[PDB]
Amino acid sequence: SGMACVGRTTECTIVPANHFGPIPGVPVGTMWRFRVQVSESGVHRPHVAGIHGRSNDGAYSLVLAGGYEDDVDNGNYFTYTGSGGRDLSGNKRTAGQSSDQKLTNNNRALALNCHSPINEKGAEAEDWRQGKPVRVVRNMKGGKHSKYAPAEGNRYDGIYKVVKYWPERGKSGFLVWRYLLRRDDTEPEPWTREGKDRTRQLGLTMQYPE
DNA sequence: CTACCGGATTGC
DNA sequence: GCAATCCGGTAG
């Protein structure tokens, strides 16, 4: 049973659900054992899903949890995969790819973060820094392939921005939507020495549920 | 490597 | 609204 089925004990209200950018008083480096806790913070509100966004506005946050084999993670930037293209009948939450992904819902949302007009064929922004920001969280299950994944739980790695997005056939040979994200943040990367020394200077530790 | 639940959010 | 979506978590 454990945390498989818990709701939030609390809701971040200090900003609303459609906040782009950092959540005040939640520094880069903050760690949480479980996803529900990350939601409570306001950093990444969806319980389960990879991306938080609205398809007419943008994506606010996302998570690297190694659920999608087409994710490739490079620390300072990375290539994320859109959701969907899966059959979840049977009240499932994850499956392997069984059909082509679509430029809709969160995939559309995240496409809108990119400083260039929405294009059903994908696009790049030349001035990508001027795009709408995305809170990036990394979870310990990216560790199988990524050396940037934390040993446990979830960690907040700061703001990144969608350099470009395009559709393409993934390792499974179904179409997937891919997004190139790149870091633009005021604090160091939690995995670096400097980033690590900063965690310590802030005295951040793993937060567990009360 | 399987199976599947409550709860959070958005789509429309 | 209310139906559809889901990068968890925990059992086996």
UniProtKB/Swiss-Prot annotation:
Residues binding DNA, per UniProt: A65, G66, D71
Annotated tissue distribution: Expressed in thymus, testis, spleen and lung. Within testis, expressed in almost all cells except elongated spermatids.
GO function term, MF aspect, one: methylated histone binding
Name used for this protein in its record: E3 ubiquitin-protein ligase UHRF1
Site (Required to discriminate between hemimethylated DNA versus symmetrically methylated DNA) residue list: N91
Any one of the GO BP annotations: protein autoubiquitination
Region (Required to promote base flipping): 47-48
Domain YDG residue range list: 21-183
Residue numbers spanned by region Required for formation of a 5-methylcytosine-binding pocket: 68-71, 80-83
Site label Required to confer preferential recognition of cytosine over thymine, positions: T81
Gene: Uhrf1
